[PDB]
Design a protein around this ligand. Structure first.
Ligand SMILES: Nc1ncnc2c1ncn2[C@@H]1O[C@H](COP(=O)(O)OP(=O)(O)O)[C@@H](O)[C@H]1O
Ligand SMILES: [Mg+2]
Length: 306
């Protein structure tokens, strides 16, 4: 089960100074349209498509939506399954500067998906602790150029992926506090340990917040399965030698198939046991409404277009 959402951030001053207009428009609660600006001495501008194309998503958001409304529409409903032992995954996707970290982390004055989700998680846990015992841990790591760091304890350095079944980052810090100011301060400071751009957080830094939840019954004279749900909340990287071993392909392409031992990325390996049959995935794509962003916005809307 997959859900795709699209969020349009408000236009920025820097886009207005460059001279941009509005070309992205939420038309509808699940449809956005992308107007084509114009330019060039070229362009047979008549066309036939010719200047406006619509895209449909499970849900859409522009500047009218608040942080909590984005949360309610995207990840709130994952929570019941996670404490019940099901797995779930939320991606913030899109080009740099379009909203990912704002949607996922937010700000002190306007928090995002992380703390809102951690918060309904601890309520749901207490409204059912009549019958159940729970254990909750969370970690917050970076993947930067396939190197993993613990964002809550950078001193430890480069960590590896060891199987402890489930694939876990061997050695990573694990928090259990239930207060949302504390979590938010943790996640704010941990965000600043993300690898920076040599010229600011690198456009190539995945931030993964994972929350594990174990659930066992308080009734001890009947066995019952012990449950382990795993929520992943991801702030992705931005959307934006002779290797002629390519007849390698022009020769596998004769009766099919496969000739490469592909390596799974760290993020794929971490998400392997999750993201499967009875597991949910929520992607939140982000765009600018600015005309100066028309090409990235169209790549994004194409990629997420349901
Ligand atoms: N929907 C939104 N509403 C208001 N401000 C936003 C919104 N999306 C992003 N911003 C702000 O604009 C800037 C966008 O940066 P950011 O969210 O870091 O983009 P990304 O994480 O995709 O690089 C940030 O300063 C953020 O606070
Ligand atoms: Mg970011």
């Amino acid at each position: 089960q997959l859900m795709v959402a699209l969020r349009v951030r408000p236009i920025s001053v820097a886009e207005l100074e460059e001279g941009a207009t509005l070309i992205a428009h939420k038309m509808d609660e699940q449809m956005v349209v992308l107007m084509d600006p114009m330019e060039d001495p070229d362009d047979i501008l008549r066309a036939h498509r010719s200047r406006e194309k619509s895209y449909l998503f499970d849900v859409a958001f522009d500047f009218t939506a608040t942080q909590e409304m984005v949360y309610q529409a995207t990840t709130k409903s994952l929570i019941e399954g996670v404490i019940s032992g099901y797995n779930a995954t939320v991606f913030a996707y899109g080009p740099t500067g379009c909203g990912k970290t704002y949607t996922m982390l937010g700000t002190d004055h306007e928090p995002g998906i992380y703390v809102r989700t951690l918060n309904d998680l601890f309520r749901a846990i207490e409204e059912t602790s009549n019958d159940m015992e729970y254990e909750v841990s969370m970690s917050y790591l970076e993947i930067y150029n396939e190197m993993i760091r613990d964002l809550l304890n950078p001193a430890l350095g480069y960590l590896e992926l060891r199987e402890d079944s489930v694939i876990q980052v061997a050695g990573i810090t694990e928090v259990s506090t239930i207060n949302a100011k504390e979590i938010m301060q943790l996640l704010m400071k941990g965000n600043r340990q993300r690898t920076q751009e040599p010229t600011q957080t690198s456009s190539r830094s995945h931030a993964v917040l994972q929350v594990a939840v174990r659930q066992r019954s308080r009734v001890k004279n009947i066995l019952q399965e012990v449950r382990q749900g795993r929520l992943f909340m991801i702030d992705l990287a931005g959307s934006e030698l002779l290797a002629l071993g390519n007849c390698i392909n022009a020769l596998s392409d004769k009766g099919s198939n496969k000739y490469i031992n592909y390596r799974d990325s760290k993020l794929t390996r971490l998400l392997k046991d999750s993201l499967g049959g009875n597991s949910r995935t929520v992607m939140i794509a982000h765009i600018s409404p600015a005309s100066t962003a028309f090409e990235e916005s169209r790549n994004t809307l194409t990629y997420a277009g349901r």
